[PDB]
Design a protein around this ligand. Structure first.
Ligand SMILES: O=C(N[C@H](CO)[C@H](O)c1ccc([N+](=O)[O-])cc1)C(Cl)Cl
Ligand SMILES: [K+]
Ligand SMILES: [K+]
Ligand SMILES: [K+]
Ligand SMILES: [K+]
Ligand SMILES: [K+]
Ligand SMILES: [K+]
Ligand SMILES: [K+]
Ligand SMILES: [K+]
Ligand SMILES: [K+]
Ligand SMILES: [K+]
Ligand SMILES: [K+]
Ligand SMILES: [K+]
Ligand SMILES: [Mg+2]
Ligand SMILES: [Mg+2]
Ligand SMILES: [Mg+2]
Ligand SMILES: [Mg+2]
Ligand SMILES: [Mg+2]
Ligand SMILES: [Mg+2]
Ligand SMILES: [Mg+2]
Ligand SMILES: [Mg+2]
Ligand SMILES: [Mg+2]
Ligand SMILES: [Mg+2]
Ligand SMILES: [Mg+2]
Ligand SMILES: [Mg+2]
Ligand SMILES: [Mg+2]
Ligand SMILES: [Mg+2]
Ligand SMILES: [Mg+2]
Ligand SMILES: [Mg+2]
Ligand SMILES: [Mg+2]
Ligand SMILES: [Mg+2]
Ligand SMILES: [Mg+2]
Ligand SMILES: [Mg+2]
Ligand SMILES: [Mg+2]
Ligand SMILES: [Mg+2]
Ligand SMILES: [Mg+2]
Ligand SMILES: [Mg+2]
Ligand SMILES: [Mg+2]
Ligand SMILES: [Mg+2]
Ligand SMILES: [Mg+2]
Ligand SMILES: [Mg+2]
Ligand SMILES: [Mg+2]
Ligand SMILES: [Mg+2]
Ligand SMILES: [Mg+2]
Ligand SMILES: [Mg+2]
Ligand SMILES: [Mg+2]
Ligand SMILES: [Mg+2]
Ligand SMILES: [Mg+2]
Ligand SMILES: [Mg+2]
Ligand SMILES: [Mg+2]
Ligand SMILES: [Mg+2]
Ligand SMILES: [Mg+2]
Ligand SMILES: [Mg+2]
Ligand SMILES: [Mg+2]
Ligand SMILES: [Mg+2]
Ligand SMILES: [Mg+2]
Ligand SMILES: [Mg+2]
Ligand SMILES: [Mg+2]
Ligand SMILES: [Mg+2]
Ligand SMILES: [Mg+2]
Ligand SMILES: [Mg+2]
Ligand SMILES: [Zn+2]
Lengths: 151, 190, 49, 111, 127, 4, 51
RNA sequence: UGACUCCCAAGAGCUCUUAUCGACGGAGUCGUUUGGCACCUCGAUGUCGACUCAUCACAUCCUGGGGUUGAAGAAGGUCCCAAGGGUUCGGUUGUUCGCCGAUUCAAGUGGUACGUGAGUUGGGUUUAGAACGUCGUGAGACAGUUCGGUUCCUAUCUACCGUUGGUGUUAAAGCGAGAACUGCGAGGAGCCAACCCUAGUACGAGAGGACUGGGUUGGGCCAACCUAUGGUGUACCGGUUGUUAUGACAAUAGCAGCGCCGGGAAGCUAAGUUGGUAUGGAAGAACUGCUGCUUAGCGGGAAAUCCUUCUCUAUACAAGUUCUCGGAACAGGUUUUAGAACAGAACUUCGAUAGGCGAGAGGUGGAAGCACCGCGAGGUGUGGAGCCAUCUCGUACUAAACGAA
RNA sequence: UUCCUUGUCGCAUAAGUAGCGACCUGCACGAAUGGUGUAACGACUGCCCCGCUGUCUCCGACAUGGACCCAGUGAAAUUGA
């Protein structure tokens, strides 16, 4: 994974990310720059996974990251009920406009599968069990193909 | 994956679609028809080959990395010229900088050839070849293997024009072939 | 270092030649809200959102 | 990705092939080991090395481990590849309790 | 790397105990294990074959920089130590006569490859 | 003498 | 490179270099050089032109 | 004046002028020494030495080929040919120079504003302070000594190192594009030592001791690579100090500019690991011989010259060749082995390109909760436990053609 | 304070135009423009030794701010063409 620096040192960067994730959980949709959203979505999914686990150690690890009591309660009750059957990808990021003043490309980022979302998301599907992969050579034998007849 | 001109080129030649193309000069008695499939048994274990590939990229780099310059001292009064090149010519005769002067610029990601690299092992079931040492390029990229020009192999042992594998062959019965080292121990006659 | 001579209009125009703007090949407008936008820009979601 | 997968398959097969021919026990830091080492540079001379494992690395066929011992009053550290064929015999004698995975403080500690 | 200014302990009975290296005989960066160095005697026993201030030859038998072998093994001692050999006969660029008669402490395996056979023979512990 |  | 080596390598370049340095130095020089066709042998393609 | 070359040859060389030299005297070459002149520059051309970076000449220091010897062999002397590649680290000195020490195949002589300060330094000389010796009545002076003393500039043009955009190269769709090449031409690479066999052979009274030919090990330089080793590894694992907050317990979070310690996978890198330091052809330098008979013809002949191996190259304007497409190629989005922008390469929904999720490898080192032992700090079990920087595999849940575009 | 001069000898170093101690041939020392010493003191000027280190052999990785790129605002010396 490419981890961005965002023009900040470590403490400022991590405090800004924790504030952004807390505000995303609180307001259910925020508009920010695209480069910040591309870093937010990973941690916003990690907190939902901690809430889906819901043990005491997960509660402690999530309280060591997010800010607020409304945030921790919402993650550990409402999101654990909502995203129970979904595997991953609880957030949607969409580019919207260009900011006057510094020409920054802006984007909505929101939690999915709720009322008043930007797009109708796919239904939650359980993952099929792990399949034993083929060898690269056995796959290369099956990957051989000819040009389609059109000319 | 292919554009329309390459799709048409493959469809006209009557071959399956490929990823990378290369052209090798041969003589008249070493030609092969269109559609011949070439394997690892084209090479014999124990011989030397030449590998050509695109080397690893370093980007824009300075003189101290590019050309192993010495630079300036880190102390003793030196000011803002720690890793610079120094002089770039003489004064007034010539009054110009000579061509080929070593200066910073883009480094690497060019084509290079490694000579006399040794074939150790051959696995024809999986079409793998174990070659001793280093090979220019990144992992996941393409290299091109010819015979060595410096240590030329034996004429009577190489398959010509290539190894013609029988069509009645199965990959179940193929064992990997190791290059013979002989019998006289190197570490004992010392 | 200072400029040795004055840059003429010919050289100034040649320098500023390649930096002129160019038109955009593809332009999308939403049929409902009527916003003129580039590809991959979100303006409206349809009804029964 | 396919190239790294190929490399992992090759390493797994090499390790499994060696493990059916030789008996190589699990080596951990803090263990006391005694092994028989043949040096091919010095006319294939075979000797016995006894020491304490202070470092380990798991890298497939190229796993390594470090031994610190005292010979004739002077401390010698030697590193051996685990699956090297010049390790004729390997035995574990004692398992001292440590709280680290690398025991590099033994160089300066007096005993 | 053993280079100009290194101070090395002496591990025979030649009468000297510490030396200061001047240069290595072959090699630009310095001397590795088994290499031959030129040195000057900094401290010596009151009775011995080598006096303080003499210029001597030596063979590095212990070095604190790790050395690799052809099977992928490494060896690393704790200090630097040499065994002095004679330098009055400069026509022999091969195995030299050691000055002393006894060699103390461990000796490396590299001396067979470097043709230090007499030091290897007079050795007691080889490690 | 001369001095800059 | 000596004249012997030049004649062994390519003989038409000798006549081309001899004529090129007697032609005047201006922008018509290559236009007039384009009209000089030199052949090593006695066979030329311009057989149907009014020679 | 200096350096170098040549002419004559008394004499030295046991004999013998010219192997090696060479008195008394002459003829030149070069532009590096010491000088002469005062032609350019005083509305400024920054001066010694060192560092970094070089490049040219050959009057050659080493390596290569030869003639002669007062050359038995080894080691040599002298002269001719040869500029492909090299030509060390330190002590006192500001030093150039030079002396010394340890090496080396050798530690060349000169030019390039005694190369190089809009590339670095500032020890000396050469401003203003102060002192010693000497000179001067004195103010002061002294290529006599000594301590101290501001080194500016954002690159317009030529030059050079890299990367791109446009455009000429009739084609038949006023034609526009994707690949695969040939190479006119240009660049790069060019080394050396030690030991062993031939051989204790040739030669020599003996002591000594080869040519040629073939291997082995090292050093220098050049091109690449990251499996292992070492270093780093600032959003990984643990330990711990001061303080503040969550009321306290329990567990954490901020700050001490990674708080400080012990490890650390990928990535980068050398101190690490690999590959080269060739072969064949042509023409030929000093020299060397053959035919002929005065004019010449021919053969052998070097680390040198030109092709061959490596890299770039059709803007190579006589503008090259082959295959293919015609809603073709582009653009936009997700990225990366690539990267300053640009460009390249992978994927773009009949899709694993990125994120998420699940499993495993790898790192750290034994989580929380519970129970037992102890007054307590603490110790033991459940348990190779818990956690996650990376890597691989499975999976369209999210974003890439959600383009009913 | 000594031109000749890196004077000569000793200590010290592998090697010392330096440093210390001698010698006297003092170009051109010398007694309140003070002579010879001197415990303590010095951001003064030399020399030697220990500990320590990227000053160096020989450089590498990482971290913050510029440099790079996009959107606003927008100088300077210089200039016969
Ligand atoms: O005057 C100077 N230079 C003049 C002209 O600029 C000339 O270059 C020069 C330089 C050095 C010099 N000298 O060393 O005696 C004399 C004149 C410098 Cl002071 Cl800038
Ligand atoms: K002037
Ligand atoms: K010679
Ligand atoms: K000779
Ligand atoms: K300068
Ligand atoms: K200038
Ligand atoms: K100009
Ligand atoms: K590493
Ligand atoms: K921590
Ligand atoms: K503070
Ligand atoms: K005086
Ligand atoms: K006094
Ligand atoms: K003071
Ligand atoms: Mg910024
Ligand atoms: Mg902090
Ligand atoms: Mg250097
Ligand atoms: Mg440096
Ligand atoms: Mg600085
Ligand atoms: Mg400054
Ligand atoms: Mg890799
Ligand atoms: Mg033309
Ligand atoms: Mg006049
Ligand atoms: Mg002027
Ligand atoms: Mg001026
Ligand atoms: Mg000559
Ligand atoms: Mg001889
Ligand atoms: Mg030269
Ligand atoms: Mg000193
Ligand atoms: Mg010096
Ligand atoms: Mg100069
Ligand atoms: Mg010069
Ligand atoms: Mg200059
Ligand atoms: Mg500057
Ligand atoms: Mg000064
Ligand atoms: Mg001064
Ligand atoms: Mg400056
Ligand atoms: Mg060519
Ligand atoms: Mg390199
Ligand atoms: Mg590595
Ligand atoms: Mg690795
Ligand atoms: Mg490591
Ligand atoms: Mg507590
Ligand atoms: Mg705080
Ligand atoms: Mg750390
Ligand atoms: Mg570490
Ligand atoms: Mg001839
Ligand atoms: Mg010939
Ligand atoms: Mg063209
Ligand atoms: Mg495209
Ligand atoms: Mg890009
Ligand atoms: Mg994926
Ligand atoms: Mg593990
Ligand atoms: Mg814990
Ligand atoms: Mg003096
Ligand atoms: Mg002396
Ligand atoms: Mg001094
Ligand atoms: Mg004195
Ligand atoms: Mg008086
Ligand atoms: Mg007086
Ligand atoms: Mg007084
Ligand atoms: Mg700029
Ligand atoms: Zn709209």
């Amino acid at each position: 994974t490419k981890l961005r620096k965002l023009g900040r040192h470590t403490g400022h960067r991590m405090s800004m990310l924790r504030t952004l994730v807390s505000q995303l959980v609180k307001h259910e949709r925020i508009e920010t720059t695209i480069t910040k959203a591309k870093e937010v979505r990973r941690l916003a999914d990690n907190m939902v996974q901690l809430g889906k686990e819901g043990s005491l150690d997960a509660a402690r690890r999530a309280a060591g990251f997010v800010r607020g009591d409304d945030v921790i309660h919402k993650i550990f009750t409402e999101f654990a009920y909502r995203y129970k059957d979904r595997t991953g990808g609880y957030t949607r990021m969409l580019r919207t406009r260009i900011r006057v003043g510094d020409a920054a490309p802006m984007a909505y980022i929101e939690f999915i599968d709720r009322e008043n979302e930007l797009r109708q998301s796919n239904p939650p599907t359980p993952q099929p069990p792990q399949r034993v992969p083929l060898d690269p050579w056995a796959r290369s034998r099956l990957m051989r193909q000819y040009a389609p007849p059109k000319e | 994956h292919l554009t329309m001109p390459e799709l048409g080129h493959f469809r006209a030649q009557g071959v399956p679609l490929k990823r990378k193309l290369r052209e090798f000069p041969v003589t008249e008695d070493a030609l092969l028809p269109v559609g011949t499939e070439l394997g690892v048994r084209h090479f014999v274990p124990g011989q030397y080959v030449d590998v050509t590939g695109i080397t690893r990229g370093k980007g824009f780099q300075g003189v101290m990395k590019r050309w192993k310059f010495k630079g300036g001292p880190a102390s003793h009064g030196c000011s803002k010229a720690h890793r610079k090149g120094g002089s770039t010519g003489q004064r007034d005769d010539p009054g110009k900088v000579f061509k080929g002067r070593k200066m910073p610029g883009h480094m690497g990601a060019a084509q290079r050839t490694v000579k006399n690299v040794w074939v150790y092992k051959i696995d024809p079931a999986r079409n793998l070849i174990w070659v001793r040492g280093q090979v220019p390029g990144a992992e996941g990229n393409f290299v091109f293997i010819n015979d060595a020009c410096y240590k030329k192999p034996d004429i009577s042992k190489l398959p010509f024009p290539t190894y013609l594998a029988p069509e009645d062959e199965d990959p179940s019965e193929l064992e990997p072939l190791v290059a013979d080292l002989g019998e006289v121990d190197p570490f004992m006659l010392a | 270092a200072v400029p040795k001579k004055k840059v003429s209009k010919h050289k100034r125009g040649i320098r500023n030649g390649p930096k002129a703007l160019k038109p955009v090949p593809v332009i999308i407008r939403c049929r409902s809200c009527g916003r003129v936008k580039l590809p991959h820009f979100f303006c409206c979601s349809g009804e029964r959102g | 990705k396919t190239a790294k997968h190929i490399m992992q398959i090759v390493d797994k097969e090499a390790v499994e092939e060696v493990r059916t021919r030789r008996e190589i026990p699990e080596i951990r830091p803090g263990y006391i080991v005694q092994l028989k080492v043949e040096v091919p540079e010095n006319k294939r001379r075979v000797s016995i090395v006894k020491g304490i494992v202070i470092a380990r690395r798991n890298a497939g066929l190229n796993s390594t481990f470090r031994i610190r011992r005292l010979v004739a009053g002077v401390g010698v550290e030697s590193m051996f590849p685990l699956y090297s064929p010049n390790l004729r015999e390997i035995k574990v004698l004692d398992k001292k309790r440590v709280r680290r995975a690398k025991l590099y403080y033994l160089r300066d500690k007096m005993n | 790397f053993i280079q100009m200014g290194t101070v090395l302990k002496v591990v025979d009975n030649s009468g000297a105990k510490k030396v200061m290296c001047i240069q290595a005989l072959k090699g630009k960066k310095g001397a590795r294990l088994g290499d031959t160095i030129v040195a000057s005697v900094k401290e010596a026993m009151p009775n011995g074959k080598v006096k303080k201030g003499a210029v001597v030859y030596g063979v590095v038998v212990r070095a604190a920089m790790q050395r690799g072998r052809v099977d992928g093994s490494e060896v690393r001692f704790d200090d630097n130590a040499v065994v002095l050999v004679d330098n009055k006969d400069k026509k022999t660029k091969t195995d030299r006569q050691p000055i002393g008669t006894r060699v103390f402490g461990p000796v490396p395996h590299e001396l067979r490859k470097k043709k230090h056979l007499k030091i290897l023979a007079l050795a007691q512990h080889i490690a | 003498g001369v001095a800059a | 490179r000596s004249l012997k080596d030049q004649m062994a390598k390519d003989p038409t370049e000798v006549i081309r270099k001899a004529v090129w340095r007697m032609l005047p130095t201006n922008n018509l020089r290559d236009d007039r050089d384009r009209k000089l066709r030199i052949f090593e042998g006695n066979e030329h393609p311009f057989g149907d032109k009014p020679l």
